[PDB]
Structure 1
Amino acid sequence: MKKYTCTVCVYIYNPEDGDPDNGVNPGTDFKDIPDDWVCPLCAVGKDQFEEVEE
């Protein structure tokens, strides 16, 4: 699983942490996050994220 970075703020989604306060368990792939999830810092949608290539 890849990290996905917000394109408009510094937030980085890390699958290992998930986003449990917003319902996303640890170990959740970015593609499986619910469609209405948003960036916890700037509130934009998943369509504004990019894969962090390795």
Structure 2
Amino acid sequence: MKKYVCTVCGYEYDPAEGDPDNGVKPGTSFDDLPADWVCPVCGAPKSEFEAA
């Protein structure tokens, strides 16, 4: 349940919540996000998130 933060905009990916609108059910770890998933608030890539 390790949270990751977007270093572009500050959105925090929370595995307990997932990201339903992008096809990511609650409980999905950051490491298991789809290869094309991007920050839902700003569009930044996963390579620009850091552990938070």
Shared fold (TM-score greater than 0.5)?
A: yes
What residue in structure 1 maps to residue 20 of structure 2? 20
Equivalent position of 2:33 in the other structure: 33
Once superposed, what is the RMSD of the aligned Cα atoms? 0.6
What TM-score comes out, normalization by structure 1 length?
0.91
- Runs of 5+ consecutive residues of structure 1 not aligned to the other structure: none
CA distance in 1, matches of 2:26, 2:47: 21
Aligned length: 52
- 2:21 aligns to what SS in structure 1? helix
The reply on whether 1:3 has 2:9 as its aligned counterpart is no
- Structure 2 portions without partners, runs of 5+: none
- Secondary structure of the 1:31 match is helix
| 3-state SS in 1 of match to 2:5 | strand
Deviations 1:11-41 (A, max 9, x none): 0000010000000100000000011000011
Percent identity between the two aligned chains:
63
Letter in 2 for 1:30: F
